[PDB]
Amino acid sequence: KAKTRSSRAGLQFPVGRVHRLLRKGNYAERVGAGAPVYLAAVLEYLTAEILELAGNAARDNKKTRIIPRHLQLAVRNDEELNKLLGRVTIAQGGVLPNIQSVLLPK
Amino acid sequence: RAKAKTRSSRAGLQFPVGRVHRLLRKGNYAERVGAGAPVYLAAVLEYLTAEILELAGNAARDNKKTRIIPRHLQLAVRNDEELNKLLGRVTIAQGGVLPNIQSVLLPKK
Amino acid sequence: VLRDNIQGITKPAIRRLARRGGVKRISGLIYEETRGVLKVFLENVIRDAVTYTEHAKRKTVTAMDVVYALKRQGRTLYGFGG
Amino acid sequence: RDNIQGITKPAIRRLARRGGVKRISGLIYEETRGVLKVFLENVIRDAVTYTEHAKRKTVTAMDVVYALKRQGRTLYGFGG
Amino acid sequence: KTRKESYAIYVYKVLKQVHPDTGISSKAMSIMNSFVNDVFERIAGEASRLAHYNKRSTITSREIQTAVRLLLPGELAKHAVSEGTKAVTKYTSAK
Amino acid sequence: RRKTRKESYAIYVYKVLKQVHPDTGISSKAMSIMNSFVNDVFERIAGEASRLAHYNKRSTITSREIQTAVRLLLPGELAKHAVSEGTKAVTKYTSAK
Amino acid sequence: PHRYRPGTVALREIRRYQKSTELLIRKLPFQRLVREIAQDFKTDLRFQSSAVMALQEASEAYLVALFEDTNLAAIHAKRVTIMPKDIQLARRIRGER
Amino acid sequence: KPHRYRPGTVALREIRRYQKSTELLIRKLPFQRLVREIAQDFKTDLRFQSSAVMALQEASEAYLVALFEDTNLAAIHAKRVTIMPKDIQLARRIRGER
DNA sequence: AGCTCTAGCACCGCTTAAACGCACGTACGCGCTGTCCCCCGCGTTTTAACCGCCAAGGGGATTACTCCCTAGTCTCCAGGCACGTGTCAGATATATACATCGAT
DNA sequence: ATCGATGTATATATCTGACACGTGCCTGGAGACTAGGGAGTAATCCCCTTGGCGGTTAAAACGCGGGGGACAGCGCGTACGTGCGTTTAAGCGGTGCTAGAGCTG
């Protein structure tokens, strides 16, 4: 029986596909054994943070299904993921509901 | 065997065509590198170097110097609007800045 | 040949775009200035996208090419493929 | 320590002269110091990390140049 | 080919592991796939460079670790790097 | 003792300068600066050419990839000049050996 | 009849359009503008619908970010009205001018 | 009486002097001590090349001068001459650093 | 070069919400003035940055040696993506109760 | 204060098309083995960095007057928000058809 490398590392993201993309992307002439495992773990951790924050935003909007607006609210509200994707715009995302204090009425 | 003649002389360039091909192969940008790609890249590099060098020579002549210093390169890059756009995110060491004063900062009589 | 479609970016469209930007009050020349800024931005992005399209021997500008043209300028766009 | 105060007020004044400013408020300098410190943080947070990759513990200029290349501010003058 | 390779099912598995009752739209799935591709490209590019810095021709776990410490912001990295080592541990204990 | 054969574009920048300004000399710091400039431009052209080569599923980098990368990242008018100069070099490479 | 004070309906639109997330520009005029601009680079081009979608929303995001910067430098100048000089100041500080 | 310049007169001369100059306007040893205390928080017992400190000084001064041009521009935009910390904060906000 | 088939373009008709032009009131940008405060010019003190020189030691570069790790090849299979189905999350309608702005 | 519109937070019945789940397959991922070349490790060395002392001087620190620029306050008038009738074209549905994307040899 053959057991996949993702279950060896306890990960959901594909280790073998990440290894294939690293080799076929021609980043280096050789690729170590643990590097695709490490990269897949980092990718699934980041996906877990984005999806958890988006699910919290969807629950706050009482929506069962995550829409791109929830993704934008997830990235932009978290200040630490914000500068990771500061240059990145998001499809159908909109902006945070921010109004300056001077423009507010008395 | 025929006489060894460099590809730069064949292309009519001063920049090394063979070194550009070697760095393209060793940089691992793609598994295959064409024949004319190092020629084209060497020509582009030579043209850009010639442009900034002649602008820096003009800047050194304006300052009446026969040696090009980093200040001359800074003045050559920034005074040309389009080379400034190429190197808008580049800082030149010991280059200084353009002498520029805003209009309202000047005193009035 | 299309002519004078920059006025298609209308008065209330620019007003709506400023409302999403948190702008409360808008001057008169803001509309013309934003039309110019949008024109130069589209000129840059469309020029890069057409340059990407010509390298593939294609005559239709793919959304994928627009995405990479936006990525080359540092404004990475998600949601249209990566 | 006190070495952040080692960037003395005439130094910020000279940098503002090179930037083209006549008048400098008294609350600028320390604020400028803080900004400078913050900027240095980022570069050092890259540069030593490159040193951490090299199994070295001296920071060469080459690592600093490629550290500065990361934030988008390429520095010409020390190598490529 | 006709085959459309993406990260849809893996992001779906991660979402169901985190929030089992929460679904995702197809557009949001496209944003997630593009986000995974972009972050993978960023980390792989930094790892390729860090291999080129020290005249190394291979990408090991140290390359990816240093690339994460440069690219992903601070305590996220302080999580992710540690978490990554755990995966490497599970790749070494299970063999 | 033994030393690595340090690699730079020092002589070629000097030959180009003597081509455009025979009288004018140049300092060593400007050798470092110009070498860094040409290395940076080489890296960005080569990376962009690899990037387009990956985009069209092409395993090779021809002169077309370099030309399109020059049209992409270099700003406008000099780009055409560069393109023309590059094309001229290609012709001088094809007319000769 | 009833009439609101000037400035409060605008604040209602700020809350409305920041909460909502669709396009604020009409699709066909933006498509015609894209066709007008693209014909300067090559005659008889064609565009995917998703290409026009991506162009429109990227332009919308860029203009909204520019409007954020413009409003910030407008309230920096002790004003609630955005002026063109606010826009040139924002684009100059951002590095695109 | 000895000749005393008007306030802001020799300031313009000092701007003109330092804009055409290229030497480093921050002293070498205080900036070196600043670098070594900042690097102490990331790894103890570090060493530094002299050219590394020179590169750090060049980049820091270039960034600070560019920030000073931006803060001067937004100070002029506020119909003022004196630069304020709010102007620096605005410049960093528009540049996307905060 | 060749074949397929698909979506992009062009046109047409209906509807209806968005835009536009105009009337109108008033909020605010701008100009002007008064005040005051705090930064700049400059003289006097002081201090440490810098230049020069020297000791030292240790660490990055260099070489040789080894060994084991991963590209490569071969073979097999099951997981991941086209396609189909079905079913339900969200939009839309009503109804009911709450916080906010305007005008008096 | 006060009430009336006016947008906003909470409970149920209906539809749809977009997403969750099931089927099929085939191709890329997994198991096994080898070489050999790249990475890890030990010994040297020399140069490059760190540390220290004299001095001494340019630059930093400090005091202090003042004046000019920052900031607060006030008047205005005009430019811009708001409302309403109109009309203009966006949006949508349907038809057709062909240039060209995409795939293969």
Author numbering:
A (entry chain g): 13 to 118
B (entry chain c): 11 to 119
C (entry chain b): 21 to 102
D (entry chain f): 23 to 102
E (entry chain h): 28 to 122
F (entry chain d): 26 to 122
G (entry chain a): 38 to 134
H (entry chain e): 37 to 134
Give the exact sentences the study uses for this entry.
We then determined cryo-EM structures of the reconstituted PIC–nucleosome complex in the absence (complex A) or presence (complex B) of nucleoside triphosphates (NTPs) under the conditions of our transcription assay. For complex A we obtained a reconstruction at an overall resolution of 3.3 Å, with local resolutions of 2.9 Å for Pol II, 3.2 Å for the nucleosome and 3.7 Å for TFIIH. The transition from complex A to complex B also led to a further detachment of nucleosomal DNA from the histone octamer. In the absence of NTPs (complex A), only one turn of terminal nucleosomal DNA (SHL–7 to SHL–6) is detached from the histone octamer surface, whereas in the presence of NTPs (complex B), two turns of nucleosomal DNA are detached (SHL–7 to SHL–5). In the structure of complex A, TFIIH contacts the +1 nucleosome only via its Tfb2-Tfb5 dimerization domain. In all three PIC–nucleosome structures, we obtained an ordered conformation of the NTT of Pol II subunit Rpb6 as confirmed by crosslinking mass spectrometry. Whereas the NTT is mobile in all previous structures of Pol II complexes, Rpb6 residues 12–35 are observed here in the active center cleft of the polymerase.
The preinitiation complex (PIC) assembles on promoters of protein-coding genes to position RNA polymerase II (Pol II) for transcription initiation. In the yeast Saccharomyces cerevisiae, PIC assembly occurs adjacent to the +1 nucleosome that is located downstream of the core promoter. Here we present cryo-EM structures of the yeast PIC bound to promoter DNA and the +1 nucleosome located at three different positions. The general transcription factor TFIIH engages with the incoming downstream nucleosome and its translocase subunit Ssl2 (XPB in human TFIIH) drives the rotation of the +1 nucleosome leading to partial detachment of nucleosomal DNA and intimate interactions between TFIIH and the nucleosome.
